[PDB]
Amino acid sequence: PFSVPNLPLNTLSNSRVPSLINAMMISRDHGQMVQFQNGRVTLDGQLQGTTPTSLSQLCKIRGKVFHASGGNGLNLTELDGSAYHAFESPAPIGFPDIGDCDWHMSATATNNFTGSSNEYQILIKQESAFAPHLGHVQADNLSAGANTDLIVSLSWISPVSDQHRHDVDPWVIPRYGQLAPPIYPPGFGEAIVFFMSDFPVVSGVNGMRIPCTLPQEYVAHFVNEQAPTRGEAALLHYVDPDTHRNLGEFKMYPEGFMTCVPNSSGSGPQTLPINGVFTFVSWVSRFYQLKPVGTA
Amino acid sequence: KPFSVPNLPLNTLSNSRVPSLINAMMISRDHGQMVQFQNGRVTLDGQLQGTTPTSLSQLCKIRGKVFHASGGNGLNLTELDGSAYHAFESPAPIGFPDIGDCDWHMSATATNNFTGSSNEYQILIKQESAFAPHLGHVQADNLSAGANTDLIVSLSWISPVSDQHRHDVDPWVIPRYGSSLTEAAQLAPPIYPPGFGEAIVFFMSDFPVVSGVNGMRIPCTLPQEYVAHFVNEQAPTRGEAALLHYVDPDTHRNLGEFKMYPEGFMTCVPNSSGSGPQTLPINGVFTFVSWVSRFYQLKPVGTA
Ligand SMILES: CC(=O)N[C@H]1[C@H](O[C@H]2[C@@H](O)[C@H](O)[C@@H](CO)O[C@@H]2O)O[C@H](CO)[C@@H](O[C@@H]2O[C@H](CO)[C@H](O)[C@H](O)[C@H]2O)[C@@H]1O
DSSP states (O other): OOOOOOOOGGGSBOSSSSSBOOEEEOOTTTTTOBOOSSSOBOTTOOBOTTOOSSGGGTTEEEEEEEOOTTOOEEEEEOTTSOOOOTTTOSSSTTOOOOOSSEEEEEEEESSSOOSGGGEEEEEEOOSTTOBGGGTEEEOBSOOOOTTOEEEEEEEEEESOTTOSOSSBOTTSOOOOOOOOOOBOOOSTTOEEOEEEEEOOBSSBTTSSEEEESSOHHHHHHHHHHOOOOOSSEEEEEEEOTTTOOEEEEEEEETTTEEEEOBSTTOOGGGGSOSSOEEEEEEEEOTTOOOOOBSOO | OOOOOOOSOGGGSBOSSSSSBOOEEEOOTTTTTOBOOSSSOBOTTOOBOTTOOSSGGGTTEEEEEEEOOTTOOEEEEEOTTSOBOOGGGOSSSTTOOOOOSSEEEEEEEESSSOOSGGGEEEEEEOOSTTOBGGGTEEEOBSOOSOTTOEEEEEEEEEESOTTOSOSSBOTTSOOOTTTTTOOOSSOOOOBOOOSTTOEEOEEEEEOOBSSBTTSSEEEESSOHHHHHHHHHHOOOOOSSEEEEEEEOTTTOOEEEEEEEETTTEEEEOBSTTOOGGGGSOSSOEEEEEEEEOTTOOOOOBSOO
16 A cells, blocks of 8 residues: 655755755746756656765765866766766766765765865866766866775765856756656646755855655655556645644655645645654545645 | 554665664674664564654754853754653653764754754754753853754764874764763663574664764664554554565565564574675565564674
């Protein structure tokens, strides 16, 4: 039988940055199409894009340092050190999927870590030399010796160094060179539900907020259960865990995203409490029409 | 509601004491006769203990407001979602690091109007007199942020104590949460190997550790994703121990048997003073077989 975790939203992580969920929102501006490569899984538990099972892999890069005149960089591996296969994913698993911005990152030596001299604050730009699908990225302020093995964490993001735009749009994915497919709102006034987390973002279009389509812990749940998809959509109730009151109904599609219908041009799930739990009710057809959620 | 463990290969899951992929299993006679880790702690029926979070997004994080004092700067702790820390329910805020008797090198970001490089702070949290997380404050070195600044702080690396009283990092020990003043309340209880010739199984991850007793290796008693699974399922504990097989996910062969106790830890029996599960592949899955008595005798696992 299909289930979603019996876990309050505000105890779970974003699937695009390692940060607690603190809000739900819908977006007319940005919610017309999304093609996030992280937080992507089918309801029967098929991982897509660069999506890991574990948050320990999310927004991480691993590789060996190269030195070139045009600039230093990393020859990418998987985070466990095994070889990256171009034919399996658009980048190594857990590779950040926030496009068209500067990545400020913290790299540590994986071999004989000595301390401060084996930690490197580096800048990865999304310019010509950014080719994760080919297995290499260019890094600025990377002083480590050639062939040094580094594990790299995303610290913060900021507007592109080359100034071709002055803000960060976290709704866009990188130009990698097997992309998780685009997701569109399915029709009849349904809007994609985005799980929001705060993250250090300089001049973000939505501020210091990062959207995703699934809590990370839902991803691990589907990959574990592998429950057969027995319908066109899973009808969910969002319920108060104390009272067991139905705060609103939502559809989860086999592609592994959620929709609601907002109340007459309203904010939809944005006004709901964030300490609620989603609960599977039943499989429903494409024809099923959701009771509008939230305020006018 | 039947008890289960996640059908997920070990090497795709996280340590529950640092956010790092599991790359090994080991037993320890030296360190493994008692452990009292505060993270990765949950009962098989899904009761969180110590400082253990559901989500890895909370693990090895600190949140607080900066204070400036003569003795030095520090953080007045909150929970990671910014809500107030109450001493009664935990030894420290949820997800607070539980690696004792070492220096914490950490990365702090401003949670309000983040401007860039000047709103990221490389800071040092020492475990000396002013380390009092249970009382809701820690002293922080090399912290330049203005008073009352709200910071979210991630563990970057750990190293031997600044005060030189030891020269290595023992990741098997937990912090003194109440300092010299009090013993912290709601500590997750100590755990010992229960059965005949049984050793506690430790899930190992690589982490930047300077001069670690086990090098760059951090032990825990549960993969983090198992914690979220038990808290989700809340399966009634119907026996004294859960018998598991560790199975090849493709091949499907049973690579060894293990016992999981209601306290939320696992044991094996090593072969004649051997490395036990250390020689097993790390891409296996644990599978629930049945409820057995505490007395049930495990087939020895591993070589030597
Ligand atoms: C190997 C060593 O001694 N490392 C320490 C480092 O030494 C410097 C320098 O002072 C030294 O003369 C020379 C080689 O011996 O070059 C090295 O780069 O100095 C740093 C900075 O203080 C120490 O780091 C600190 O050590 C503390 C324990 O004594 C504690 O772990 C702190 O957290 C850590 O920052 C090196 O230990």
